Structure 1
Amino acid sequence: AESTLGAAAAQSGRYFGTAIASGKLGDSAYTTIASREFNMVTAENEMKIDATEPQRGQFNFSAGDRVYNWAVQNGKQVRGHTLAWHSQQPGWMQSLSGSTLRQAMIDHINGVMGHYKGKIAQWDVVSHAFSDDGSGGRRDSNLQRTGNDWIEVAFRTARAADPAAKLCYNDYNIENWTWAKTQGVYNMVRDFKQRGVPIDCVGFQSHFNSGSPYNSNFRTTLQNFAALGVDVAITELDIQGASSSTYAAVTNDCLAVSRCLGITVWGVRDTDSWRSGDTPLLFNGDGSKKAAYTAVLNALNGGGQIKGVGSGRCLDVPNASTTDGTQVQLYDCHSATNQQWTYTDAGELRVYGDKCLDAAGTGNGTKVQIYSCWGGDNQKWRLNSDGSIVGVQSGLCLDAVGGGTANGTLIQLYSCSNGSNQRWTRT
C-alpha cells in the first residue's frame, strides 16, 4: 500500500502518526482524513497529568480512553503522552513538593500506566526536563527540586508498571547536534544505558521554525542516539511554512535510521494546529493535501521544462508574455525562460522568477494561466508520482484542452483521468 502516509511508512516497518484531539472526533472532515492517513495516534492533551488525575488518587480516563479507543478501532497504535513533566499539572499536584511530590509522581505513573497496561506502544515517561538557557542542564521545576534522580526513578517506576511499553524521554530543541540542550540529553541517555536505567527511546518533538530551524545534522543526532542502543522517534513534527523540501528531508532522516520507529506530525489540518499561524502541517483547513503531503508520501514510497507526455510538447507562456492573466499552452520544447518552471517549497510553479502558474477558478474547464505570485492555494500544485499535476485548491488536474497536442493547445483544470494529456514529465 502506498497511497496514504501510514501505509507507505509501513512499507519500511515504520508508522506515520498524528496528534488527535478528542473534541474533534465529532468532525467528519477531521476523522475522514485522520482515520485514512495515519496508523499511530498520540492524544494531544487527553493523557496528560491534569486530564488523567484531576484530583489526587482520583483518576479520570474518560477523554484518554475516547482517543485510545478511536485509535485502536481505526487501526492505529498509540503513544502515551505524557506521564511526568512540569507543564499542565493539576492544581493539587502544582502545590506539592519534596517527597510528597515524588510519591505523587510515582503514584500518577502507576495509575495511568496501570490503566493502559499492555495497550500502549510507547510512553513519553518524562518530557521537557532540560533548559533552553544554553547551559545544557535540567530546568528548575517542582519535579526537579525533589531530586536530580527523579527522571531515573520515573523510568524504573514505568518499567515495572508496564514492561511491555517502550519508554521514551521526550523533548524539543534537541534536534540540532551542536546545541547544548541536545548534548545534555545525549549525556543523560548515555549514562542511563551504561548504568542500566530502563529507557528504550528518545523522542524528538521536532517543532521547527525560523527560530529553531531544521538542520540536516538532525540525521546525525538521530544516528548518534541510535548508536547508544535506544530507538528514536520523531514525535510532534510541524514545520513553520510547511516547506515541501524540509518535510521530505525530515521524513528521509527517519528512513535513513534503522532505529527510527516512525514519525508523528502534531495535528491533522493547519486549522487544528496549536500553531495555525505557522501553517505547519500537511493538510489545509479545507482538508486539501499540501505540496508537502505529496513530498512526504513520495519520500515514504522510496523517493526546467514541464513536458506533456501525450503531446511531447512543453508548458509554455505564449510569446514569453509576463502579463497577468495569460493562459499557458503547449509548444515545441526549447530553452527560453518562458518554458522554465521552478517548483518551490511553497508548492508553486514559478516562471520569470515572480510569476505563478495560476488557476482562475475551481471547476472543470478553469483556465490555467500566469499571475503575480501571492501565496494563494490556487497557485499551489502537487506533482504526483503518476505524472499528474493537481491544483491544491481545486483538486483538479492540469489538462491539455480536448486532448490537443499541437502548438497552441491551451491548458485548463479538469477532473483527473490519468489521460496522456494530464501526464507531465520534467526534463
Structure 2
Amino acid sequence: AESTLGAAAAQSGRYFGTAIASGKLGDSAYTTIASREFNMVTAENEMKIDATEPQRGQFNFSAGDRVYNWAVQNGKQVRGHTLAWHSAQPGWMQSLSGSTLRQAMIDHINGVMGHYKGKIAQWDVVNEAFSDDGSGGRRDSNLQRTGNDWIEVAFRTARAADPAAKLCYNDYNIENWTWAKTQGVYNMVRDFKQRGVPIDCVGFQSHFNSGSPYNSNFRTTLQNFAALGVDVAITELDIQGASSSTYAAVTNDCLAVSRCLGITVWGVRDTDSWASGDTPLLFNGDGSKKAAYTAVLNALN
C-alpha cells in the first residue's frame, strides 16, 4: 500500500500529513479525503498561543482537543504548532516584557506540552524568529528583547516538559540554500548542536510561489541541515499553480534525505488554503484529485 499518500510515504519510513481546521470537520467531503489520504495532522490554528492561553494563567484546550481527537480516531499522528512565536499572542502577553515575559513563555510551554504529554510526535517549539530583511539576523520581537538566549531556553523547557516529543524550530523562506535567512538559521542550529541545546529537528515550511520560488538547491539545504545532526521536515508545503514537476521535485528532495521524516501539505483542498486563489494544494474544491496528486504518489511509490 501504495494507493494513498500516507501509506505510500509509510513504505519508506515517512509520513504524509495535512493541516486541519476544526471549523471544517462538519463537512463530510473534507473529512473523507483527509481521513483517507493522510497519516499526520497539524492543527492549523487551534494550538497557537492565543488559542491555548487566551487568558493569563488559564488554558483552553477545546478546539485543540477536537483536532487532536479527530486525528487519533482516524489513525494519524500529530504535530504540535506552536509553542513560542512573535505573532498570534494574546493582549496580556503582548503587554509584557523582560523577565516577566520570559517567565510567561516558560509557563506557556509547560502548560500546553503538559496537556498533550506523550501524545505529540513533533512540536514546533519556536516558529519564525528570523527577519525577512535579508540580514540573516533575529527578528526584533518582545521575545528577542528578553535576551538572545530565549530560543535556547524555549528548547530546554520543552525537553523537560515532554521528553517523548521531537522538538522543531520552524520557519519559512529558509528553503533556498544561498539566501541570508537560511544561513542565519543554519548558523544557529550548528551553534546549538555544538553546545548541546536540545533541538531534534528543523521545519521547512516550504511555501513555494513567485516571491520565493522553488529552487533545486532545496536538496542541498536539507542535506546540509541533516549533517548537523538533526532531522528535517517539510511542514507547510504548498506550491502556487500546483505544477506537477515541482510537486514531484519537492517530494524526491525529501526521499533523497534519510533524516527527512516526512511531508505535510498546508490544507486539504484548494478552497481550504490560506491562498485559495493560488490553487496550490493537491485537491480541487470538488474534492477531485489534481495532476500534482499523481506525481506526488508516483514519487512516493
User: TM-score normalised to the size of structure 1?
Assistant: 0.70
For each residue in 1:80-103, what CA deviation from the matched residue of structure 2 results, as whole angstroms up to 9, or x when unmatched? Answer: 000001011111111111101000
Structure 1: which 5+ runs fail to align? Answer: 300-426
Counterparts of 1:290 and 1:191, CA distance in 2: 42
| Cα offset, 1:273, TM superposition | 0.2
- SS of the residue corresponding to residue 237 of structure 1 reads strand
| Cα offset, 1:177, TM superposition | 0.3
| Cα offset, 1:210, TM superposition | 1.1
Counterparts of 1:132 and 1:54, CA distance in 2: 28
| Cα offset, 1:198, TM superposition | 0.3
For each residue in 1:245-293, what CA deviation from the matched residue of structure 2 results, as whole angstroms up to 9, or x when unmatched? Answer: 1000000100000000000000000000001011110000010100000
- SS of the residue corresponding to residue 125 of structure 1 reads strand
Counterparts of 1:72 and 1:218, CA distance in 2: 32
Counterparts of 1:52 and 1:85, CA distance in 2: 13
Counterparts of 1:297 and 1:225, CA distance in 2: 26
Counterparts of 1:21 and 1:270, CA distance in 2: 14
- SS of the residue corresponding to residue 56 of structure 1 reads coil
- SS of the residue corresponding to residue 19 of structure 2 reads strand
Counterparts of 1:96 and 1:38, CA distance in 2: 39
- SS of the residue corresponding to residue 87 of structure 1 reads coil
Counterparts of 1:106 and 1:67, CA distance in 2: 24
Counterparts of 1:57 and 1:103, CA distance in 2: 12
Counterparts of 2:92 and 2:244, CA distance in 1: 44
Aligned-residue CA RMSD (Å): 1.3
Counterparts of 1:138 and 1:187, CA distance in 2: 12
Instruction: Please name the residue that 2:95 is paired with.
Output: 95
For each residue in 1:22-43, what CA deviation from the matched residue of structure 2 results, as whole angstroms up to 9, or x when unmatched? Answer: 0001110000000000000000
Counterparts of 2:56 and 2:2, CA distance in 1: 46
For each residue in 1:305-350, what CA deviation from the matched residue of structure 2 results, as whole angstroms up to 9, or x when unmatched? Answer: xxxxxxxxxxxxxxxxxxxxxxxxxxxxxxxxxxxxxxxxxxxxxx
Matches within 5 A, 1:248-327: 248-299=248-299
Say whether residues 1:115 and 2:115 are aligned partners. Answer: yes
Structure 2: which 5+ runs fail to align? Answer: none
Displaced runs of 4+ in structure 1, greater than 4 A? none
Counterparts of 1:51 and 1:206, CA distance in 2: 24
For each residue in 1:188-226, what CA deviation from the matched residue of structure 2 results, as whole angstroms up to 9, or x when unmatched? Answer: 000001100000000000000011001000011000000
Larger Rg: 1
Instruction: Please name the residue that 1:361 is paired with.
Output: none
Between Structure 1 and Structure 2, the one with more helix by share is 2
| Cα offset, 1:298, TM superposition | 0.6
Instruction: Please name the residue that 1:396 is paired with.
Output: none
User: TM-score normalised to the size of structure 2?
Assistant: 0.99
| Cα offset, 1:154, TM superposition | 0.1
- SS of the residue corresponding to residue 19 of structure 1 reads strand
- SS of the residue corresponding to residue 264 of structure 2 reads strand
| Cα offset, 1:3, TM superposition | 0.6
Instruction: Please name the residue that 1:78 is paired with.
Output: 78
Counterparts of 1:145 and 1:206, CA distance in 2: 28
Counterparts of 2:29 and 2:54, CA distance in 1: 31
Say whether residues 1:166 and 2:187 are aligned partners. Answer: no
For each residue in 1:345-381, what CA deviation from the matched residue of structure 2 results, as whole angstroms up to 9, or x when unmatched? Answer: xxxxxxxxxxxxxxxxxxxxxxxxxxxxxxxxxxxxx
Counterparts of 2:63 and 2:170, CA distance in 1: 22
For each residue in 1:5-48, what CA deviation from the matched residue of structure 2 results, as whole angstroms up to 9, or x when unmatched? Answer: 00000000000000000000111000000000000000000000
- SS of the residue corresponding to residue 120 of structure 2 reads coil
- SS of the residue corresponding to residue 183 of structure 2 reads helix
Instruction: Please name the residue that 2:186 is paired with.
Output: 186
Counterparts of 1:220 and 1:158, CA distance in 2: 29
Instruction: Please name the residue that 1:334 is paired with.
Output: none
Matches within 5 A, 1:123-134: 123-134=123-134
- SS of the residue corresponding to residue 202 of structure 1 reads strand
Counterparts of 2:132 and 2:77, CA distance in 1: 32
| Cα offset, 1:167, TM superposition | 0.1
Counterparts of 1:31 and 1:244, CA distance in 2: 24
Counterparts of 2:181 and 2:240, CA distance in 1: 21
Counterparts of 1:96 and 1:210, CA distance in 2: 37
| Cα offset, 1:149, TM superposition | 0.5
- SS of the residue corresponding to residue 137 of structure 2 reads coil
For each residue in 1:141-166, what CA deviation from the matched residue of structure 2 results, as whole angstroms up to 9, or x when unmatched? Answer: 01111111000000000000001000
Counterparts of 1:111 and 1:212, CA distance in 2: 36
Q: Which has the higher contact order (CA 8 A, sep 6+)?
A: 2
- SS of the residue corresponding to residue 153 of structure 2 reads helix
- SS of the residue corresponding to residue 235 of structure 1 reads strand
Counterparts of 2:58 and 2:229, CA distance in 1: 37
For each residue in 1:40-75, what CA deviation from the matched residue of structure 2 results, as whole angstroms up to 9, or x when unmatched? Answer: 000000000000001011000000010001001101
Between Structure 1 and Structure 2, the one with more strand by share is 1
Say whether residues 1:224 and 2:224 are aligned partners. Answer: yes
- SS of the residue corresponding to residue 267 of structure 2 reads coil
